From a paper:
Interhelical interactions between side chains of residues at the e and g positions as well as the packing of these amino acids against the hydrophobic a and d core residues also contribute significantly to oligomerization-state specificity of coiled coils. This is exemplified by the trimerization motif Arg(g)-h(a)-x-x-h(d)-Glu(e) (denoted R-hxxhE where h(a) = Ile, Leu, Val, Met; h(d) = Leu, Ile, Val; x = any amino acid residue) that specifies a three-stranded, parallel topology of coiled-coil domains. The trimerization driving force of the motif can be explained by optimal side chain–side chain interactions whereby the strictly conserved arginine and glutamate residues form a distinct, bifurcated, interhelical salt-bridge network and participate in the formation of the hydrophobic core by establishing tight packing interactions to the neighbouring residues at the a and d positions through their aliphatic moieties. Because of its substantial size of 18 continuous heptad repeats, we used a combination of trimer-specific determinants to switch the cortexillin-1 coiled coil from a dimer to a trimer. Accordingly, we rationally substituted residues to complement two ideal trimerizer motifs of the type R-IxxIE and introduced one additional hydrophobic core isoleucine residue in the trigger sequence of the cortexillin-1 coiled coil (referred to as Cort-Ir-M1).
Because high-resolution structural information could not be obtained for the full-length Cort-Ir-M1 trimer, the aim of the present study was to perform a detailed structural characterization of two fragments spanning the trigger sequence of the trimeric Cort-Ir-M1 coiled coil using circular dichroism, anatytical ultracentrifugation and x-ray crystallography. Accordingly, the conformations of side chains and the position of the water molecule between Arg7 and Glu12, and Arg14 and Glu19 can be superimposed almost perfectly onto the trimerization motifs of the coronin-1 coiled coil, ccβ and GCN4p-M3, demonstrating structural conservation of the motif (not shown). In the structure, the five introduced isoleucine residues can be accommodated in the most preferred rotamer at the hydrophobic core positions.
Residue numbers in the entry:
A (entry chain A): -1 to 25
B (entry chain B), C (entry chain C): 1 to 25
The structure:
Amino acid sequence: GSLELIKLRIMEIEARIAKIEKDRAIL
Amino acid sequence: LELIKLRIMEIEARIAKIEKDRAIL
Amino acid sequence: LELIKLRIMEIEARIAKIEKDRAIL
């Protein structure tokens, strides 16, 4: 239900942010 | 939960702004 | 809701770090 969907959206956002962080790293 | 859904929407909006304004993503 | 709220705070802080990140170009 709603709690499980919130958790999925959170997971998706966490991955989204992690990708940007990795992509903006100092070389 | 309603407040949480609210933060989530606002979070996605900040991400969209980043995705729009930054070159390096 | 406690772990969800923590995860939201952590997201927001990480998003703040991106918003205030260096301009790479």
